[PDB]
């Protein structure tokens, strides 16, 4: 089974899921960095403008809904949502599963007013699930219908298909060459060992090793504040409040950035990480690499998001606790 994804400005990749009977449709991001499912709730005060601007789940319109009511708060890197748990049937890519998910009643304008999607579907392990709620992928596996306990992500370039998730395998149509796997450091987290990060000609980063969280829900490739400062200084980039910029005319001149993973070098060109909006020296162009301090126990750690996945088709293998990469087609 595959899920068709929409690509919004190269920063938000989302697909549709249906909740309830009759189905209530929601745009959601599939995030390997978290493990809970959530959508905005009809019980969310309209004082939260983000709730006024998104699809709201109304339990009183679903005959398959099952009440629970346990309170839950979900804390992400860029924001927080709070609400309560509910159960209902969820349709995802043709598969139907009963699932416990969050009905959000508090959703801050910043950053959710800037969200194209309505909610999130955690693709992480149950070990990171808040409130110990069984993750949707564990529930699907329990049905014993998938041919493989693995799911794969394909994120297309902005263009204007936006992207695609395959539940149960991989799509040969969107990758070439063969996969090269890296074993997970531990079950419970889609995190892997990274042997090093090189910029141009000088592996001046992640010497002695570091961690890499393969995060489909992250728009960019991120590193700790210290690591990014070095990487950026090397790039000649200036720091701003929420990102790093470079004078556009110099975007094409930026060096390659490479990521040593499992005995293979994954290299990005400047075209791969800079939002080349123009070429003027009087304009600033943002970079798809940010500074993000991810808290323990998962962090500190680098995060390989869309910027990376766009270049490399990614397969998450639950049966063998490994992650595979292959050149995206």
């Amino acid at each position: 089974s595959s899920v068709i994804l929409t690509n919004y400005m190269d920063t938000q990749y989302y697909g549709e899921i249906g909740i309830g009977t009759p189905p209530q449709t929601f745009k959601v991001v599939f995030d390997t960095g978290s493990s809970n499912v959530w959508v905005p709730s009809s019980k969310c005060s309209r004082l939260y403008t983000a709730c006024v601007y998104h699809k709201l789940f109304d339990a009183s319109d679903s005959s398959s809904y099952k009440h629970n009511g346990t309170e839950l708060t979900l804390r992400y890197s860029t924001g927080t949502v709070s609400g309560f748990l509910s159960q209902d049937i969820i349709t995802v890519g043709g598969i139907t599963v009963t699932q416990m998910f969050g009905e959000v009643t508090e959703m801050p304008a910043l950053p959710f007013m800037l969200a194209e999607f309505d909610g999130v579907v955690g693709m992480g392990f149950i070990e990171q699930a808040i409130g110990r709620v069984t993750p949707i992928f564990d529930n699907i596996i329990s049905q014993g219908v998938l041919k493989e306990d693995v799911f794969s992500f394909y994120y297309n370039r902005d263009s204007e298909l936006g992207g695609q998730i395959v539940l149960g395998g991989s799509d040969p149509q969107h990758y070439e060459g063969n996969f090269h796997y890296i074993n997970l450091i531990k079950t419970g987290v889609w995190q892997i060992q990274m042997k090093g990060v090189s910029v141009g000609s000088s592996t001046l980063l992640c010497e002695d090793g570091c961690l890499a969280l393969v995060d489909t829900g992250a728009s960019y490739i991120s590193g700790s504040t210290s690591s990014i400062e070095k990487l950026m200084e090397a790039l000649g980039a200036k720091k701003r409040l929420f990102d790093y910029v470079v004078k556009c005319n110099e975007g094409p001149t930026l060096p390659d950035i490479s990521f040593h993973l499992g005995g293979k070098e994954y290299t990005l060109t400047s075209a791969d990480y800079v939002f080349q909006e123009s070429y003027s020296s009087k304009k600033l162009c943002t970079l798809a690499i940010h500074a993000m301090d991810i808290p323990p126990p998962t962090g500190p750690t680098w995060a390989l998001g869309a910027t990376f996945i766009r270049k490399f088709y990614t397969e998450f293998d639950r049966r063998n606790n490994r992650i595979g990469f292959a050149l995206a087609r």
């Binding site: 004082l47 708060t73 804390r75 992400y76 860029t78 508090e106 910043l110 990171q128 409040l241 993000m292």
Partner: protein, 423 residues
């Protein structure tokens, strides 16, 4: 410009009085030294961290989204018919954020959402909640009236004086007033007898116009007799445009195809940025104030249906992302704008947020020692535009149009308004 990354990396949750009665307005209060004010605001803008600049931008966007939220009235905003049809998202947000100071659980927890909360997505209680937002919103004013690379007199002015008129024997608390001080220097709490609304309304105008020095579009309009508090923000915008001149001969305008109006003008010669969307039939030119600040003039291509087109000038992320930066030689021509404008926030907000009910609710405390029953929470603006002496595009605004001044440095639009006819 332009994108916004989403960081969806789950983690293990983390985080982190002496009251006084104000004097009567009969007391001789000296007027606001407007030079002294802006020279203090530029210092606040100057002595400001790089982190604070992001906060000023952030609180700017919250003010933007609140303004777009408020268009949930669906073309009834101008229905609040007092003076010229123009509202200040930044002033609205601020006046609303200042009431948040005087708010306990529930009431603060409503305004949190209504104002646009929680800036941080949490209420660990600190100097940011109410105190951070207010002083951040002070910053955004200094960011507008900047002239960083200009150095010399930028010619744009933004005054914001907050009147807080309590009833007799209402001992309003100190730390609340220091909170208001963070939002604006000119905080003028002064008592008044609200039992006589006629006598209060006429004196409240006589006080402010004396203190401020600009005619505000009435005051204490639609305020109940059995009231105490009257939290009124007063803003005044000066906007001088170089390369412009006032015409002795009026070009006249048509508010509709049939009727005509004798009205002034402002001719403009210069190569500005402008790009017309042919999808929804659009066209917008500008006349920047040091780039930082920019007056965007939204022209409806056909100009037949504004209500539909103008709707796309309060439309969430689109109005801001309208930023192709395509330069062109344009002959600017627009009416001379010098109009007041009042609007009560409790009439301005309703149903979706229904604060009118929440305002007359008991829970305030942090402001209110005694019983508070608000008569009006007014935002009054005095928008003013001025001039300082091979091929082209003759962009005239002969029929009604839309506009909005926007700050790039604080990513915040200070004003948005419609022009039917000057009167």
């Amino acid at each position: 410009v332009y994108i916004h990354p989403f960081h969806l990396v789950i983690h293990n949750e983390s985080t982190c009085d002496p009251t006084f009665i104000p004097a009567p307005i009969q007391a001789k209060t000296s007027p606001v030294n407007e030079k002294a004010l802006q020279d203090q605001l530029v210092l606040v803008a100057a002595k400001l961290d790089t982190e604070d600049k992001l906060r000023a931008a952030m609180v700017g966007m919250l003010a933007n989204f609140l303004g777009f939220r408020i268009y949930g009235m669906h073309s009834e905003l101008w229905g609040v018919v007092h003076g010229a049809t123009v509202l200040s998202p930044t002033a609205v947000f601020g006046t609303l954020a200042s009431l948040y100071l005087g708010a306990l659980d529930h009431t603060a927890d409503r305004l949190q959402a209504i104002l646009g909360v929680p800036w941080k997505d949490k209420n660990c209680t600190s100097r940011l909640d109410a105190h951070k937002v207010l002083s951040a919103l002070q910053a955004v004013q200094g960011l507008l009236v900047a002239q960083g690379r200009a150095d010399s007199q930028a010619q744009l002015l933004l005054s914001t004086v907050v009147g807080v008129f309590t009833a007799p024997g209402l001992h309003l608390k100190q730390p609340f007033v220091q909170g208001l001080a963070l939002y604006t220097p000119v905080v003028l709490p002064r008592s008044l007898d609200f039992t006589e609304l006629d006598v209060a309304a006429e004196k409240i105008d006589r006080f402010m116009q004396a203190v401020t020095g600009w005619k505000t579009g009435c005051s204490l309009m639609g305020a109940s007799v059995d009231s105490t508090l009257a939290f009124n923000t007063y803003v005044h915008f000066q906007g001088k445009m170089k390369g412009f001149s006032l015409l002795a001969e009026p070009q006249e305008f048509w508010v509709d195809n049939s009727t005509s109006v004798s009205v002034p003008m402002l001719s403009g010669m210069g190569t500005f940025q402008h790009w017309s969307d042919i999808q929804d039939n659009f066209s917008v030119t500008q006349v920047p104030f040091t780039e930082s600040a920019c007056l965007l003039l939204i022209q409806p291509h056909y100009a037949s249906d504004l209500d539909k087109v103008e709707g796309l000038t309060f439309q969430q992320n689109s109005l801001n992302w309208m930023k192709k930066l395509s330069p062109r030689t344009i002959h600017l021509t627009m009416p001379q704008l010098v109009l007041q404008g009042s609007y009560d926030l409790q009439d301005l907000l309703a149903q979706a947020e229904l604060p009118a009910i929440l305002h007359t609710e008991l829970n305030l405390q942090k402001l209110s020692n005694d019983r508070i029953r608000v008569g009006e929470v007014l935002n009054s603006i005095f928008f003013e535009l001025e001039a300082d002496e091979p091929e082209v595009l003759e962009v005239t605004l002969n029929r009604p149009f839309l506009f909005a001044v926007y700050d790039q440095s604080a990513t915040a639009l200070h004003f948005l308004g419609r022009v039917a006819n000057p009167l």
